Amino acid sequence: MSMVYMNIMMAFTVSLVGLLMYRSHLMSSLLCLEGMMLSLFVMAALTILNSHFTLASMMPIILLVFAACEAALGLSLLVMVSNTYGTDYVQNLNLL
Amino acid sequence: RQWQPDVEWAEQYGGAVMYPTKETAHWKPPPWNDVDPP
Amino acid sequence: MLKYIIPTIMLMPLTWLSKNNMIWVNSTAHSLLISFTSLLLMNQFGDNSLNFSLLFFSDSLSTPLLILTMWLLPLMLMASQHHLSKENLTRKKLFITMLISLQLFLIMTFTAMELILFYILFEATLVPTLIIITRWGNQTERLNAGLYFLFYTLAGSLPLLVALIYIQNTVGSLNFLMLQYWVQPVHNSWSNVFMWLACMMAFMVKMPLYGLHLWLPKAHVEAPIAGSMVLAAVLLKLGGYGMLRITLILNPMTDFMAYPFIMLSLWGMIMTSSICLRQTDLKSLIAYSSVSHMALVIVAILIQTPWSYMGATALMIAHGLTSSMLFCLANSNYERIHSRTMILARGLQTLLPLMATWWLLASLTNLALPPTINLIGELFVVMSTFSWSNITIILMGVNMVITALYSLYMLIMTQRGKYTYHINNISPSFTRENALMSLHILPLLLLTLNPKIILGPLY
Amino acid sequence: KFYIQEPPHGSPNWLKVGLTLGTSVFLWIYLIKQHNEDVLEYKRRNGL
Amino acid sequence: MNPIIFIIILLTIMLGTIIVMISSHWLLVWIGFEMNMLAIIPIMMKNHNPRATEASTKYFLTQSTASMLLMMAVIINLMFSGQWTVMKLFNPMASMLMTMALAMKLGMAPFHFWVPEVTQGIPLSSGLILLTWQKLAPMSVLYQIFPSINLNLILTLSVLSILIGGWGGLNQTQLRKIMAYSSIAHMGWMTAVLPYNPTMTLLNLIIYIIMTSTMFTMFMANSTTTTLSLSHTWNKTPIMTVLILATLLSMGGLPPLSGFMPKWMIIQEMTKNNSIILPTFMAITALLNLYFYMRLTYSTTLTMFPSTNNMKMKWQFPLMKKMTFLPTMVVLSTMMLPLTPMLSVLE
Amino acid sequence: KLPKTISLAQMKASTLVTNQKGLIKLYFLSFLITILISMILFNFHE
Amino acid sequence: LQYGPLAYILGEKATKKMTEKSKLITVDGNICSGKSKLAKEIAEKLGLKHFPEAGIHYVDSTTGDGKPLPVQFSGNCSLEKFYDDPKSNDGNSYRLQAWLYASRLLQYADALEHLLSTGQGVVLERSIYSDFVFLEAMYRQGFIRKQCVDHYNQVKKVTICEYLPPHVVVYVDVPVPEVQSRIQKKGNPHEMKITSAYLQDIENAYKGTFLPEMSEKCEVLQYSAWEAQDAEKVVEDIEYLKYDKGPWLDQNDRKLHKLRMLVQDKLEVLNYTSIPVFLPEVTVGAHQSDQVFQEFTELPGRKYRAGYNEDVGDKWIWLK
Amino acid sequence: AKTVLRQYWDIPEGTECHRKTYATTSIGGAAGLVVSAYSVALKTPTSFLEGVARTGRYTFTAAAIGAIFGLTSCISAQVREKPDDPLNYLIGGCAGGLILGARTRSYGIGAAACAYMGLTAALVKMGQLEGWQVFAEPKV
Numbered sequence A: 001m002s003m004v005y006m007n008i009m010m011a012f013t014v015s016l017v018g019l020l021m022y023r024s025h026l027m028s029s030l031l032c033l034e035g036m037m038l039s040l041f042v043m044a045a046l047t048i049l050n051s052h053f054t055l056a057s058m059m060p061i062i063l064l065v066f067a068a069c070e071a072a073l074g075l076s077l078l079v080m081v082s083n084t085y086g087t088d089y090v091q092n093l094n095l096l
Numbered sequence B: 001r002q003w004q005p006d007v008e009w010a011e012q013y014g015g016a017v018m019y020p021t022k023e024t025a026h027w028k029p030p031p032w033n034d035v036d037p038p
Numbered sequence C: 001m002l003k004y005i006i007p008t009i010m011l012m013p014l015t016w017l018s019k020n021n022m023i024w025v026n027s028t029a030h031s032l033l034i035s036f037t038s039l040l041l042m043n044q045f046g047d048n049s050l051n052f053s054l055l056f057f058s059d060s061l062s063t064p065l066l067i068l069t070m071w072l073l074p075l076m077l078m079a080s081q082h083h084l085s086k087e088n089l090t091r092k093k094l095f096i097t098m099l100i101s102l103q104l105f106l107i108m109t110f111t112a113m114e115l116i117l118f119y120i121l122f123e124a125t126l127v128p129t130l131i132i133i134t135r136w137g138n139q140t141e142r143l144n145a146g147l148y149f150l151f152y153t154l155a156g157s158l159p160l161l162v163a164l165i166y167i168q169n170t171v172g173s174l175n176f177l178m179l180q181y182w183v184q185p186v187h188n189s190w191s192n193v194f195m196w197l198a199c200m201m202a203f204m205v206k207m208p209l210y211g212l213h214l215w216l217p218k219a220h221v222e223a224p225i226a227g228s229m230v231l232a233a234v235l236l237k238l239g240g241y242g243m244l245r246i247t248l249i250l251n252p253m254t255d256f257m258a259y260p261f262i263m264l265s266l267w268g269m270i271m272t273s274s275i276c277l278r279q280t281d282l283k284s285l286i287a288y289s290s291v292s293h294m295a296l297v298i299v300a301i302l303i304q305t306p307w308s309y310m311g312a313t314a315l316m317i318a319h320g321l322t323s324s325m326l327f328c329l330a331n332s333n334y335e336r337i338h339s340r341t342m343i344l345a346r347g348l349q350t351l352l353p354l355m356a357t358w359w360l361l362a363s364l365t366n367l368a369l370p371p372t373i374n375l376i377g378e379l380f381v382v383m384s385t386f387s388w389s390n391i392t393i394i395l396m397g398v399n400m401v402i403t404a405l406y407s408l409y410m411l412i413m414t415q416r417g418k419y420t421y422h423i424n425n426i427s428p429s430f431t432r433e434n435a436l437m438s439l440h441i442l443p444l445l446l447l448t449l450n451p452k453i454i455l456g457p458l459y
Numbered sequence D: 001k002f003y004i005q006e007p008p009h010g011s012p013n014w015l016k017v018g019l020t021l022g023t024s025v026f027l028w029i030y031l032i033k034q035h036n037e038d039v040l041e042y043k044r045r046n047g048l
Numbered sequence E: 001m002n003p004i005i006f007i008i009i010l011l012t013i014m015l016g017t018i019i020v021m022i023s024s025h026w027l028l029v030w031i032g033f034e035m036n037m038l039a040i041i042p043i044m045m046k047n048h049n050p051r052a053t054e055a056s057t058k059y060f061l062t063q064s065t066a067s068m069l070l071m072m073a074v075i076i077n078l079m080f081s082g083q084w085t086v087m088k089l090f091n092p093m094a095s096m097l098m099t100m101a102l103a104m105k106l107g108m109a110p111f112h113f114w115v116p117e118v119t120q121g122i123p124l125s126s127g128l129i130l131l132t133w134q135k136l137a138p139m140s141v142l143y144q145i146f147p148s149i150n151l152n153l154i155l156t157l158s159v160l161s162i163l164i165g166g167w168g169g170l171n172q173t174q175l176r177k178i179m180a181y182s183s184i185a186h187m188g189w190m191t192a193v194l195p196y197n198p199t200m201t202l203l204n205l206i207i208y209i210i211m212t213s214t215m216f217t218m219f220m221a222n223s224t225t226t227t228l229s230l231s232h233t234w235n236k237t238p239i240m241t242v243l244i245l246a247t248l249l250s251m252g253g254l255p256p257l258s259g260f261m262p263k264w265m266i267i268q269e270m271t272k273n274n275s276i277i278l279p280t281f282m283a284i285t286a287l288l289n290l291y292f293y294m295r296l297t298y299s300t301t302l303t304m305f306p307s308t309n310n311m312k313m314k315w316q317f318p319l320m321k322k323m324t325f326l327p328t329m330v331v332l333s334t335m336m337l338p339l340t341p342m343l344s345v346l347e
Numbered sequence F: 001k002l003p004k005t006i007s008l009a010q011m012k013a014s015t016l017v018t019n020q021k022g023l024i025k026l027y028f029l030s031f032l033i034t035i036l037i038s039m040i041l042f043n044f045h046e
Numbered sequence G: 001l002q003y004g005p006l007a008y009i010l011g012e013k014a015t016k017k018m019t020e021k022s023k024l025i026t027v028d029g030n031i032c033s034g035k036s037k038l039a040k041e042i043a044e045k046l047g048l049k050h051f052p053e054a055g056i057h058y059v060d061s062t063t064g065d066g067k068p069l070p071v072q073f074s075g076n077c078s079l080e081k082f083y084d085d086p087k088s089n090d091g092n093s094y095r096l097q098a099w100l101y102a103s104r105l106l107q108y109a110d111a112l113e114h115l116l117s118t119g120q121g122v123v124l125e126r127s128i129y130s131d132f133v134f135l136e137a138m139y140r141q142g143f144i145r146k147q148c149v150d151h152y153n154q155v156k157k158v159t160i161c162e163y164l165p166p167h168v169v170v171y172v173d174v175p176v177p178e179v180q181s182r183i184q185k186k187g188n189p190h191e192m193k194i195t196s197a198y199l200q201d202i203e204n205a206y207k208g209t210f211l212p213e214m215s216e217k218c219e220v221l222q223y224s225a226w227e228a229q230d231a232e233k234v235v236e237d238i239e240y241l242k243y244d245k246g247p248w249l250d251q252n253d254r255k256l257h258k259l260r261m262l263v264q265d266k267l268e269v270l271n272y273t274s275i276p277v278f279l280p281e282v283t284v285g286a287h288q289s290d291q292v293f294q295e296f297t298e299l300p301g302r303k304y305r306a307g308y309n310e311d312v313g314d315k316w317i318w319l320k
Numbered sequence H: 001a002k003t004v005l006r007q008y009w010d011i012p013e014g015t016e017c018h019r020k021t022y023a024t025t026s027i028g029g030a031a032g033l034v035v036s037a038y039s040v041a042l043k044t045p046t047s048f049l050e051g052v053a054r055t056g057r058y059t060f061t062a063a064a065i066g067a068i069f070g071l072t073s074c075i076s077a078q079v080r081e082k083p084d085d086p087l088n089y090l091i092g093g094c095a096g097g098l099i100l101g102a103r104t105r106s107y108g109i110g111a112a113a114c115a116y117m118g119l120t121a122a123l124v125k126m127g128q129l130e131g132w133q134v135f136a137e138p139k140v
Ligand SMILES: CCCCCCCCCCCCCCCCCC(=O)OC[C@H](COP(=O)(O)OCCN)OC(=O)CCCCCCCCCCCCCCCCC
Pocket: C090, C091, C094, C127, C128, C131, C135, E237, E238, E239, E241, E242, E243, E245, E246, E249, E256, E257, E301, E302, E330, E331, E334, E335, E336, E337, E338
């Protein structure tokens, strides 16, 4: 494949590995989730633009809208977690 | 008359887990109403 | 078979819609009428089986087992109603419903043409039987008895299901009439060795085969009287009936595959007979006695001779009445002294003279006195296994001696000697109890006059 | 008047009882007809 | 929560699932999962306590991660085939990513850990949605991509879910965790037969939902979340103990009950394909489920546990919960085996 | 002059499965190991 | 319409019914402090519904025909026996207290239901909020064990958190030497066995713990035995309260729909009074509870749901 | 796995014992590493070295079980001159079971492992001879 797909795919894997390998802050994991969306956006846009598939030009915008909305929900859970414990540390989320 | 479970028999199923181990020795049954104290 | 299925189902509304104080009268009376009509199944032909429909048939193997099943329901009702007298009315009706639902599954099990239908019904009998033991047993370890009984069965029955479905795919059918004509020989291969074991192990557990038998004494010690009666008389014979049918499609592999089970049976019958000499629980002694008798049935089925199959059929019927009668006799003592310990209440012939006679007759049939059908069945098996190998007569003969020893030991220990001084509540035998004992032994002894109706298809 | 508080189901809900029975009668009539046109259509198609 | 908002949110949960089931475009499938996750989070949180917030967060993180893996597979699929049609995928790495994405959504082992955690932390009614309705959308996608799924991956996932689900339930005293592990094992049966006959996947799914809804509905009618609380049922509503007994025997696959049907039919399909070892192993492992189902029947219906004096006060009041559809569901949960040939309507 | 063993085996296997810390970090770390194994060992990506 | 989300959606919202009159008032005090007479006066002067103090048979009075049931259907809890023998080894003392907390809890849910469905205020005599003063006195006097107090607090923790406290707490203060005098004149043979130490413990809990806690969240009005006689002055004070504290100010229609959905379902209300905690004093063996339960079903109008009992004259059962 | 498993089956029974022992030890060690990876990830070791010790215990135990099985099973086939015999794997399976009893310092685990590993190994040989399928390709 073209050069770019290597690095974009590598970027997605890096953020996925970052997502699966938590540290302490829940916000850091949420950043890795949005990093994955970004690389999906770029890889989608490049594929759609290069093939000149015109109607799919909207697809990456739809992806950005829904992922941002998902990110807003994730942020809401983060603040509700932080209100309970005073931090967003994931090791506080072990009652279950 | 026919035997029925007593308190000692019933208390087997009241713990956090069915089979206690050293790993889960600190586990406690969750709150009755699901609400942990603030 | 609808003339038996439907009236059996109607026993349920009969029981639930009866007046509170008529539940035992009505269920007993009408179950006896169903038992009477069951004798219409004796229309057997020399060549063809009695094939009612696409679902059910009755040959000379299933007919005697059907009659025994429907005879046993009123006897279980009579035997149960005393220790359930304090139960509330709804729970009494639920108990009777389990017994009726057990009859329904059993008569369908014995008459199904297709083997998957037999499997489902064969499995369905587990539910009411398990519920009868765990809900209406007296002691704490009835819960464990249920799990042992449940999981011994399913450990063998699930491989049977896989084999049955595999056989239908290969052959195209599991209708037993079709299998008789489309059966093909089983060649040697590891695949066929496991097909053989999957086709047989479920029935071995039910019998039970020696070495897979420890669930049985556990179950009997915990079951209420009706549970023991149906378990000893009918539920064990489901495995015997299953083996007699499925061996059709296992030749010639049964030739060498039977050996380890024959060895277990031949030696197991001596071991379990000896164990009876040292049992201290009367119910556990009768349970071990069943294991020893059913070991003969397993040998008969595995060696596959016309004489052995006839003996197996007679032994299965004869044992069912005899063992059920012994549990009823043991239970009559228990309802007075509230213990199963055999040595607790001695010298009971002095106190209960007529019940001593029933004990005597039950013991005489248990040790197979000629010409009881107990001996007829045992003798036919002994005849046939001698041809299989002459040395078997040594183990057969030794087992006869030990069986006489423990059968009469039971009789001498409980009925003879001196009575226990402090046991002062041995009230006279009730009419219900005397009728119950006589309703076992009289038909058993009347079968001596016409044994042919219990000798099965090979007759 | 046994009950201290009037039970919720002291009196039958006559609107509900009428709707219930109307539904049962409607469904049975719709089913019976449905069967009849199915039988006629089946015979017509197969020439019976 | 306002009752109108609750209704609109529930309709959004259903709508997102329905979008997945009617969509021919991978993007709309992905939207349906996104819509569906957004609307279910508030019903997980509706009791507002630390355990519900933890469950909601764990659920969000799992489902969001699976949605990104799903979209990655879709985009890889677009690169190598240039189209978005929902069907077989045209790249084996896309197939593996989507299979693992869908396995995560279903909560199959080894992606199972969230199912007991999340189910315990949310109300019974929310747990009912999580373990039934939420299975439809991922299963409907697996129903369409199965020709391109790797057999070893799908069968490995199926075998692990049956093992983990069975062993996980043995150690449980919480009813919600019992349901969670029971659910994990049942998913393994559903996906094990998928490579052979998807119709038997649908049959297993429908019956599992019926039996699962019955148990949750009965737990809700009494407000029982633990085994010991459920052991007081005999001294309040004796009929419920009998119904719970029958449904538990059915969820264990005992004939002649309805729950025997899906395992019976799955064993048949596998053997028709000369698969003997796998169905045999699955059937025997399923005896683990039967053990801890039977344990509940012992403490609930077949014995009588000790009661408390204040229980007498409860005798004076009736059940006011709706228990909607329970009489129908319990009958279907237990008495459907004579109608097994009706499965052809799923073809 | 065994049911106990099978039951003991299952009981032990149950404590291995269910004795878990409840930590987000450890569960998602196990997802990475599963994904790595699925590729390197079994080649489920082919 | 039976109240539910549909009735709420169609306009059955609490704020339409409730006014400034919509107040929950409870009257507290020691034994023989005159709280009952004052409670009735406050109710009729302010036009509120009076609830007499919930006793052992409060639950009976709200179900069936309203008449008390035999004692075996309350567990044989006896206030008379509690006085005759406080340290009975049958566990009567705490069995009674655990029962009375459940009775008060039931009454509180009934009073809250009345307020939310009609808008009319209510007057209670003691409540789940003040029920612990008897627990504390029993424990300090050795009548109950510490394990009983642990059980009581568990039940209280997961029950009282669901409810709103009274708008107004009217406390009548009578000294222990006076209370003991009022008891003697009353002439109750069993109640005359009470000790001043027990009475003093009741007072300490009211002043040590109850009143300091209520004042944070309620309007607390205190009166002496003499001042409590002028019910017009007491009623005059209530009408001048500002109602500036407490959670009642945070409530709205949505949060009151949830509360009404709870208090109208008495089994939800009583769910945790029967937590499976095996305390000897409140645990009942299976054989006994099975036997008593069967007898209960045999009482008139108790076999079936209310409205489905032919033995008490219910009709049209085949259309209901 | 496919590469290593195919190597084991390619070598005929009772010939090239060392080559068989490498395949099983490699297979056993890989299984032990897999167990260690999950054990470390889910049950966190107290210290880094403690994690390294645990990986060595599981990885050596699994490799030792695999090594003895391949050695024992292949010698038996060679000594007995019975290549396509399931009993050789029954002997090998039990030997591996005993080592587990030794590593865990239990006679019960050794007795159970002998029976459970021995039957499993013998069934694998019947499956190879008879062509039994564990993950069967969809045919119908
Ligand atoms: C037809 C094809 C399909 C065939 C498959 C078989 C389907 C059967 C399952 C059907 C679905 C479940 C419905 C079962 C109906 C149960 C009816 C019943 O048991 O009686 C109810 C009784 C009521 O008790 P109560 O509230 O107190 O009112 C009476 C006053 N005592 O309750 C009680 O009194 C409680 C008594 C204690 C419980 C005793 C436990 C033993 C009774 C078990 C009977 C149910 C067996 C179900 C299991 C499946 C059977 C195969």
